[model samples]
Target: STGSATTTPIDSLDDAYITPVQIGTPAQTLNLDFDTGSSDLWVFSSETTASEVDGQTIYTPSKSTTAKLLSGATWSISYGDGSSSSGDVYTDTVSVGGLTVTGQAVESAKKVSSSFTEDSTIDGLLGLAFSTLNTVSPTQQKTFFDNAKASLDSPVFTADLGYHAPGTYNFGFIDTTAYTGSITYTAVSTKQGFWEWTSTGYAVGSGTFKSTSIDGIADTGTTLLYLPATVVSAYWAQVSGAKSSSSVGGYVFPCSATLPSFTFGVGSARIVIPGDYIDFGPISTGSSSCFGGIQSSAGIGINIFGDVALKAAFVVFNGATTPTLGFASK
Candidate 1:
């Protein structure tokens, strides 16, 4: 058997987001975000003393009847957003759904910066996307899939973020009820630390480009979708009619127009984006107003499809089989 089914919600109440999962015999809970950009499971703890972990939930070991701390090991993670955390390693009996995995490694932040400290809704992140992009060294530290893979009934894991309900990110066995058909699986590449993929190009409205090839990773950790300048320009050019006004950050396009549809081709699978995602918020730069879902990352080499694109598809990160990613329509 692969493992039993497990699930936890990724939602915020008051100012904190809590993902309730059974950790050990007595049942314990922790706060986490469903991140696809990287692989790792970390939590904030009362032991974190470098800064105030306000607006975020911090785990108290004393609260649990079964919690174990790994004395000397240390962990640190740095994100593309320039935020990072460093902590000591700890192992505990963690449970999710009906499956139980003992000696699971968790990071307890000893030092957290202001970037992470201010986020009230996010306490910790549960990376369920891919293993190749894991920030942890040795690549086999501990991930949500790694711990639960042995206990599941199928060699698969799926995430269902119920409609616009931000907190309902579910995990564990592939829930076919959440999707329509069999998931299209993509073979993992022998790459390092980056969940890279090939995209023919991105389309907006009726305008499409043939020469554009997007090579980067997809992440749920980021809120905004970052694209290349050429692709960004092409997208804005087609939606020029919807352009309203430019701001200090990015362009702010009129959300009134029926935004164009965009598609991404990954070998046999074709991922489509509806118009609702194209009508984005105000832009930071005083240029043409653009959609809320699209942002310009001129100097960055990697193009990231953040939460905006994730809502439209069912993403599966099958680290148990290999370092491959799978996607299906909802």
Candidate 2:
């Protein structure tokens, strides 16, 4: 059966658009960030330290009769942001929307970084990357989408992320009504365990276009767009008061700057991200300075199309044998 569900933000978090995921037999629902950048379905559980757990809800395996602990399994993951989580293993019935996957590996966190421990809304990460990247020790685990593919009429999922607005993650079938214009498809290389693709071209403020082959990943869990340092510098140079701030880190600009729009190529599709979306938000309280959300993915060796860029288009994370990325205007 097909499934569709809307995503919600944590207050004005403006970063991730999370959805409800029911894990276990009795169905304890948790708000998890559906990440396209990694592979591993993990959650905050009774195994987490009491002080680290804070106000975040914990998952209890004892309540679920279907739950089973892997004899000597464990998992550890560190994100690009430096935040991390490591934990024990569990197999349970996990459901997203009406779609259910039995005997799914669920990583229950026994330890979490300050970034996760402090965030009360985000309980865990629902990894959407390929199963090849699964971190389950002893035996690799399959992602929820990977396990449920056999049951779906069409093996596909669509991400309709929004800007401080509601968006939907539809599984099995694409809702034609949710997007406008024809979808342009691009081939993706999943060797990196990500929805990785090459951008054909780019332009700053509608200026001279440069034909460059930039390799990057479409990451739903990331809040800001990351590009090469040269690309980022070119775009910010058009802004009068923008500067690379050592204090603010990355780049910062005056709130009053009239920033120009950025354009990037996805095959023949040109996705334009508004200047307003680039201004991540205020860097400090009672200050007129704001941090630029579009950063330089310098040491990382890849660009990231995060929320800033993804919100501008309706994306299809196709997990077929070819593994392609489809984009259309929302």
Candidate 3:
């Protein structure tokens, strides 16, 4: 029989999404942010300092009958946005839906940055990217998918990220009923532990395809779409009062702007972002300003096809030696 697990996306205070996860013996459940940008199943745990804890639910090693510390090992990771976490290692049982992974490497945090500490809802990050990006010292760790792949009917997973709505993640097998139209596939290029791909081109607000290719990663952990600086400027130009502001560190615009749909080419398929989704919700309250959901990926070094862009289509992540991405409209 095929083995798999399903997950539902829950909204976060910071416009992020969380997938419920369970760790430890009696099953300590927490809302985890499934991140393809990194590899580490680190959780807020008993090791975290009292003052830094806030309202987060921490995993207690002593309470989990299946948990065991990996002596002398430690890990530390920093996100592209500068948020970070550090901790020691433990091996334990972890399950999502009906699928379970035994002896999974779980990093239990002793310290977390201000951004993470402030996020009361996300109990931890479940890294779904390649294990090469794991932060464990001396040896990199395997992701939950990697540990459980042998049990799956097919080594694949699909993501249906939502905008202020619930979405699902399917493992082991594809559900044809969830998506429509012919599924278009393109070979995936992995580097730096990301699902990297070269996009054919892009157009802003139904504009002409620009011809130049853009290389980027399919990162669900990130909240907004990030493109090249030149491409970002072109999109922002169409909207009134839109500018790249140093104060907020991204493009911002008046709440009244009428944004056009943005589209990107992927092999023969194209993913379009509706205009309404471009205004990434209110960033400030007083006068009513919103952050442009699309921004420059300048210093980040890679364009991120984040939730704003990915939610426009259903996606398949194949687990072949050299992975491939399949896309179709939902």
Best candidate, lDDT-wise?
2
Q: Can you write out model 3's per-residue Cα lDDT over 1-330, one digit (the tens) per residue?
A: 243344444443226777777788899997788887788999999999878888998899999999999988899999988899998999999987667889999999999999988989889998888888888998778998888788888888788877667777777888898888877888787766788888888898868888778989888888889999999999999998888889888998988888989988888678888888787756765656778889999988789998788888888888888898888887
Displacement of the residue 282 alpha carbon in candidate 3, Å: 2.5
Q: Give the TM-score of candidate 2.
A: 0.97
Over the stretch 50-89, how does candidate 2's per-residue lDDT look in tens digits? 8899787779998989999987999999998899999999
Superposed Cα RMSD, model 2: 1.2
Residue 92 of candidate 1: its Cα lDDT? 73
Q: Write the per-residue lDDT of candidate 1 for residues 54-140, one digit (tens) a residue.
A: 866677666766677666567788887788887776677765544567777766777777777877656677666555555554334
Model 2: which ten-residue window has the lowest total lDDT?
Answer: 9-18
lDDT for model 1 comes to: 0.61
Clashing pairs in 2: none
RMSD of each: 4.4, 1.2, 1.7
TM-score of 3: 0.95
Off by over 4 Å in 1: 1-18, 129-140, 166-172, 207-212, 241-247, 255-258, 280-291
Provide the overall lDDT of each model, using Cα atoms, as 2-decimal numbers. 0.61, 0.88, 0.84
Model 3, runs deviating above 4 Å: 1-14
Give the per-residue Cα lDDT of candidate 1 at 300: 60
